[PDB]
Amino acid sequence: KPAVSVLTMFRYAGWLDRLYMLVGTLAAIIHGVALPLMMLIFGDMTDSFASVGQVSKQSTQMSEADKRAMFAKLEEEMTTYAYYYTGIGAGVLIVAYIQVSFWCLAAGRQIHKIRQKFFHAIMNQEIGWFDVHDVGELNTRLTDDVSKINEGIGDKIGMFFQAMATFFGGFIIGFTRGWKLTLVILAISPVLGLSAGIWAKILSSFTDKELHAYAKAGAVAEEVLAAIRTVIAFGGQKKELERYNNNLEEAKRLGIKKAITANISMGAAFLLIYASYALAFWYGTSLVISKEYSIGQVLTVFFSVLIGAFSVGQASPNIEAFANARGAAYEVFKIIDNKPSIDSFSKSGHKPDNIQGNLEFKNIHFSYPSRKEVQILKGLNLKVKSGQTVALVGNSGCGKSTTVQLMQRLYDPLDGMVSIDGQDIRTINVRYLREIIGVVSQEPVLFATTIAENIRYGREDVTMDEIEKAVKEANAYDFIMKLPHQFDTLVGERGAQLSGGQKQRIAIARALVRNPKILLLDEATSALDTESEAVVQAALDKAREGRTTIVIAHRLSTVRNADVIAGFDGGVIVEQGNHDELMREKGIYFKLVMTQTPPASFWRILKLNSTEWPYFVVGIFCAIINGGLQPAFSVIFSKVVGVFTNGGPPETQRQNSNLFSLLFLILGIISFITFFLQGFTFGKAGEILTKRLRYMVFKSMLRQDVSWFDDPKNTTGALTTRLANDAAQVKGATGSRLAVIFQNIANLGTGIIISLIYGWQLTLLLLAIVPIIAIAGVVEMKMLSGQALKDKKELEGSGKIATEAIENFRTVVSLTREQKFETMYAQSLQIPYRNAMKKAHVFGITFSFTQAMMYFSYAACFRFGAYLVTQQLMTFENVLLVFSAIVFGAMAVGQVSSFAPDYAKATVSASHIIRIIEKTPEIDSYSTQGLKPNMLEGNVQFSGVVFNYPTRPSIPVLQGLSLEVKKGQTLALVGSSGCGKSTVVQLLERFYDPMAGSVFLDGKEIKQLNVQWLRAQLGIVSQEPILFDCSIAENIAYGDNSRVVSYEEIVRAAKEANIHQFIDSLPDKYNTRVGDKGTQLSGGQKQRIAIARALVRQPHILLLDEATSALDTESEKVVQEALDKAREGRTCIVIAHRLSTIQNADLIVVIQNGKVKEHGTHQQLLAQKGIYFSMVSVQAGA
């Protein structure tokens, strides 16, 4: 919404840039003007053939006589027109180069300047300005917005003016050569504007419906694939597929409905558009029979106007290009034009010599940019004498840290003054002030360059001698020399990551080359390892003694030797003095002392699509007819102008034109009828295989075993996404693109034959010319993408050293050396500039070439069409025919190149989808194999089990685990931590087979047992029960599948679980809808429901996995009261973390390191003393 003055935007264009734009825009208008002229001549060529076309047939007496006057007229005329044509082509060749080159030149020249100025502006902002802003956004704002600006002031303007030139130029010629047809042509404009308006309403409204339509299915898929382990446990994999299939079934119906309507729309629209012209032209005929117009003039106006008419449309994008570029320039120039109070690029203010370094802080009230919300310094008084070293101590607020902030004048204070020597800080030059102050900060930063270079950021003029003394005076010499490459090493976020204590010591060296008279050390020892801390501390102590210093840390080791110590409470300076005095004060300081002590041929996807042998042949046959039908319109048009040009005696013409125009409208209706067909057939044929594919994928997906679903690669979202995209994308490829690709090859084919047989060698020529301009049209785009990628690569290097400068900014400014990064940025940019210059010459040449190639190619159409061909008996009516036929047949091939990516994007999306079906699991629930034992009573043996999770085969969970539990008794399971407790239940559900060892139930190894039948006997109840959205009766009935469960049966289970209070309490009762769509309830009820479905199954085995995990107060007491009633009739395993409620358990088992450690009945483990005793003691105590 905000935008910029048109004149400010160009403020960096002067002298030449203004001229370039003037010559370019000029040439741009000449260029535009060229096309409607070219069409004007196409009238005069017509009148020439038309005068001879009328007189030639008017004879029917003399022959040789017509070999004289006619041919002479054609000779002089055609040569004239051809000469002019060759003229225009040269014209466009020149202006088209001038157009793009100059504008791109201006663009480059300015954007270079914009970029430099912009970065300079970023570095000039004071810190309070950064504190309030997001640096990341600002950098992305550096690289993206300047690009928008460049796009707008680029050759797009030239294009705009070329377009307006064709539009004006079109409608002028439109009006002068006649006022009638133009008005008649504008008259039909609203209709075309109106039909394409139905499209923006249909598309936008229906696009949501499908996104709404599948949103119902992909919801199923989301609550399923999220709940997977549950549906896997309860084996609802047949139902959860059935549901998805039932929503898919609707989606396809809506999908076919859309297919019907959208094609009706497209067809009807097209028919309106073509009827609309055909009337303008037939109206154009009605005025020729009246001898009001010439048959060539009808052309001249009818072309010029439609050209100019569409030229409006072709300009519209460049308007947007420019506008966006204005709006993009607003926030950029706002930084450039913003001026700081502080600067630091300013040359102003005193520069004292012989600074003795006497500092004082007077009544300083300050607040950081968070402003009125907080005031962190309320008053203040502090002096520090020259050569002394003062220490600042405090509990919190780090108002300590603020004084170091004010002393570099990063912020100016609200009220009060900071005084270096006698003078107010604000009277001294900012840069020089920063140059007389050294700084060592808590988190040290090193820019990416050599150590010498980072030290060279202390001062730009320095020699390895001074570097050496500096690092040796920081005692950083010894440790870096050992490092390879010596001072030439690397540092940064990338490469050569070092000890912090070494980084700080390079930082102290950097600070030391500064030879500052004032030192600020903030926390520099804090957040550092104890051993190296002393190493650095020594350097700090050696860094002072030449200087006056203020230091802030939480280390009261370094403070003692400070000449003065200062405490803060609430921004108010409170205690000051030598250490001893402060202790004698027994105040804040003392208190703190005591406290701290693969693209490939995939046919099989089409083989799946072969489920329909028909609906393809229908569409294809139907589309090829449509292909053959298109050029016939050109044939008509050719003979409408043809017979009319070839007329001879005028009486017969008027009756014929009617016949033709009638036929054409019979063809348009036959075209509509074929088009809707080729649309609908493919559409339905797409929508059904969409179902088949999504079905088979979703089916194969429920086949895989928990091992797969654990993968970081596959998460619920990524799968729904993979599920939608891949299925849409293959529909696309077998969809419209193919129908069209066949319609068009048919269109060129049926055109090329007609043309070829009519014109001998006329066509053969056009087929030499067209492919070359096409290819030449492609190579340009290749070069374009090439240059684009290259420049992207090059400005990226610069933006990288920008990112460094502005992300680490508060440090660079502390060191000054902003001019450094300015210069570096500048040098970096210099390559894309010299590049951007070449870009213009290239862009220009390619464009001009592809225009010229078209105009000269036009000259060849007629010069050969006349002369050699029309000096022969071969005729004009045909030359027109072949012009249109071939030239359109080609432009229909233009659609091939456009649908090219739709195929690739589809095959890649097929690539995964054919694999996701074919992948098979280790444990497949689908295998009907497995024993299905007849004997009821459950036992469970875990023997010698070693298990590692497939995702994390590093730290093992189970190593040599062994358990046994008899029927009808509870096995309590305790652990130090982890899924060691929980993995048991997973393995009994056979989510996994163990690596080594084995687990039996009835004495049969489950590994050889039927996977499904196994899980069918299991009473799984987990931490967070996931309930699908549906009647709670169904969430319960989920407990048993392969059969519909009785109402009284799901009642009994809700009676069991103690959930009945709710289920009767509700208005709907058992038909109420749950899952946070229809209704919401707390976890206790959800759980009791999960308990209900657990024992609807009438399992022989409950599995209670930390069932009380999320729960509170009486809710626990009631759920536990349900679980406790659920077991004791069954084999049970309870890993519950309430050991108070495990006290009554037939066996308790303590898991340690995946081995069982302790086991026995409660009092039996209580009789011992060890892990379980410690477990029951700790949380009974706490």
Ligand X SMILES: Brc1ccc(Oc2c(Br)cc(Br)cc2Br)c(Br)c1
Q: Tokens for 1070? A: 């058992």
Site residues for ligand X, window 86-125 (CB under 6 A)?
none
Closest by Cα among 505, 343, 472, 360 to 425: 360
CB of 184 to ligand X, least distance (A): 13
395 is in an annotated binding site: yes
CB of 191 to ligand X, least distance (A): 14
CB of 112 to ligand X, least distance (A): 47
**Closer residue to ligand X in complex, CB, 71/270:** 270
Q: Is 274 in the site for ligand X (CB under 6 A)?
A: yes
**List of residues 6+ apart from 1131 with CB closer than 8 A:** 938, 939, 940, 965, 966, 967, 968, 969, 971, 1100, 1101, 1102
**Closer residue to ligand X in complex, CB, 653/986:** 653
**Closer residue to ligand X in complex, CB, 303/366:** 303
Q: How far apart are CA 950 and CA 581, in angstroms?
A: 65
In degrees rounded to 5, what are phi and psi of residue 698?
-60, -35
Q: Is 675 in the site for ligand X (CB under 6 A)?
A: no
Are 1053 and 1098 in contact, with CB atoms under 8 Å apart? no
379 is in an annotated binding site: no
**Closer residue to ligand X in complex, CB, 892/1090:** 892
CB of 640 to ligand X, least distance (A): 5
657 is in an annotated binding site: no
982 is in an annotated binding site: yes
Q: Is 297 in the site for ligand X (CB under 6 A)?
A: no
Map residues 613-632 to x or -, x wherever contact with ligand X holds by CB under 6 A. Answer: -----------------x--
In degrees rounded to 5, what are phi and psi of residue 575?
-110, 140
Which part of the chain contacts ligand X (CB under 6 A), choosing from 271-279, 470-478, 541-549, 822-830? 271-279
978 is in an annotated binding site: yes
**Closer residue to ligand X in complex, CB, 274/695:** 274
Interior angle at CA 493, CA 492 and CA 499, nearest 5: 70
Are 223 and 1073 in contact, with CB atoms under 8 Å apart? no
Angle separating helix axes 155-177 and 69-124, nearest 10 degrees: 150
Q: In what order do the strands lie in the sheet with 1155-1160?
A: 1018-1021, 1101-1104, 1131-1134, 970-975, 1147-1152, 1155-1160
Q: Which own/partner pairs from 994-997 qualify as long-range (CB within 8 Å, at least 24 positions apart)?
A: 994/945, 994/946, 994/947, 994/958, 995/946, 995/947, 995/948, 996/944, 996/945, 996/946, 997/942, 997/943, 997/944, 997/945, 997/946, 997/960, 997/961
980 is in an annotated binding site: yes
Map residues 577-616 to x or -, x wherever contact with ligand X holds by CB under 6 A. Answer: ----------------------------------------
**Closer residue to ligand X in complex, CB, 228/880:** 880
495 is in an annotated binding site: no
Q: Is 640 in the site for ligand X (CB under 6 A)?
A: yes
Q: Is 54 in the site for ligand X (CB under 6 A)?
A: no
CB of 894 to ligand X, least distance (A): 14
Q: Is 740 in the site for ligand X (CB under 6 A)?
A: no
CB of 632 to ligand X, least distance (A): 9
Q: How far apart are CA 873 and CA 931, in angstroms?
A: 90
CB of 881 to ligand X, least distance (A): 10
In the set 167, 633, 644, 709, which binds ligand X (CB under 6 A)?
633
Q: Tokens for 731? A: 């529909």
975 is in an annotated binding site: yes
Q: Which residues of 550-563 are buried (b: 16+ CB within 10 A; e: fewer)?
A: bbbbbbbebbeebe
Q: Tokens for 515? A: 């030879």
Q: Which residues of 849-883 are buried (b: 16+ CB within 10 A; e: fewer)?
A: bbbbbebbbbbbbbbbbbeebbeeebbbbbbbbbb
CB of 268 to ligand X, least distance (A): 15
First to last CA, the chain: 61
In the set 20, 281, 698, 883, which binds ligand X (CB under 6 A)?
281
Which part of the chain contacts ligand X (CB under 6 A), choosing from 329-337, 453-461, 633-641, 766-774? 633-641
**Closer residue to ligand X in complex, CB, 632/738:** 632
**Closer residue to ligand X in complex, CB, 279/592:** 279
Which part of the chain contacts ligand X (CB under 6 A), choosing from 229-237, 274-282, 308-316, 1066-1074? 274-282
Q: How far apart are CA 813 and CA 578, in angstroms?
A: 34
Which part of the chain contacts ligand X (CB under 6 A), choosing from 533-541, 659-667, 1002-1010, 1054-1062? 659-667
CB of 889 to ligand X, least distance (A): 10
**Closer residue to ligand X in complex, CB, 266/278:** 278
Q: Tokens for 977? A: 């931590």
**Closer residue to ligand X in complex, CB, 160/633:** 633
In the set 84, 270, 277, 1013, which binds ligand X (CB under 6 A)?
277
Are 1089 and 1070 in contact, with CB atoms under 8 Å apart? no
Tokens 């009246």 -> residue: 290
Report in angstroms the alpha-carbon separations of 482 from 454, 467, 486, 502: 18, 16, 8, 13
848 is in an annotated binding site: no
Q: Tokens for 801? A: 């050293």
CB of 302 to ligand X, least distance (A): 7
DSSP character at residue 1045: P
Binding residues for ligand X, how many (CB under 6 A)? 14
**Closer residue to ligand X in complex, CB, 274/602:** 274
977 is in an annotated binding site: yes
CB of 762 to ligand X, least distance (A): 17
CB of 921 to ligand X, least distance (A): 55
Q: Tokens for 189? A: 């404009």
Which part of the chain contacts ligand X (CB under 6 A), choosing from 656-664, 835-843, 1026-1034, 1137-1145? 656-664
**Closer residue to ligand X in complex, CB, 662/868:** 662
CA atoms 716, 720, 726, 729: torsion sign: negative
CB of 788 to ligand X, least distance (A): 34
Q: Is 664 in the site for ligand X (CB under 6 A)?
A: yes
Q: Is 634 in the site for ligand X (CB under 6 A)?
A: yes
979 is in an annotated binding site: yes
In the set 262, 278, 325, 524, which binds ligand X (CB under 6 A)?
278
Which residues, listed in sequence order, are joined to residue 1151 by a DSSP beta bridge?
A: 975, 1156
Are 155 and 322 in contact, with CB atoms under 8 Å apart? no
820 is in an annotated binding site: no
Tokens 């005076």 -> residue: 473
1046 is in an annotated binding site: no
In the set 615, 637, 644, 1172, which binds ligand X (CB under 6 A)?
637
CB of 897 to ligand X, least distance (A): 20
Q: Is 270 in the site for ligand X (CB under 6 A)?
A: no
396 is in an annotated binding site: yes
In the set 99, 125, 645, 884, which binds ligand X (CB under 6 A)?
884
Are 533 and 503 in contact, with CB atoms under 8 Å apart? no
In degrees rounded to 5, what are phi and psi of residue 1020?
-50, 130
Q: Is 646 in the site for ligand X (CB under 6 A)?
A: no
CB of 300 to ligand X, least distance (A): 14
Q: How far apart are CA 230 and CA 1025, in angstroms?
A: 9
User: DSSP labels for 398-420?
Assistant: THHHHHHHHHTTSS--SEEEEEE
Which residues, listed in sequence order, are joined to residue 549 by a DSSP beta bridge?
A: 389, 519
1132 is in an annotated binding site: no
Q: Is 661 in the site for ligand X (CB under 6 A)?
A: yes
Residues in the annotated binding site: 394-401, 975-982
* Annotated binding-site positions for ATP: 394-401, 975-982
Binding site for ligand X (CB under 6 A): 274, 277-278, 281, 630, 633-634, 636-637, 640, 660-661, 664, 884
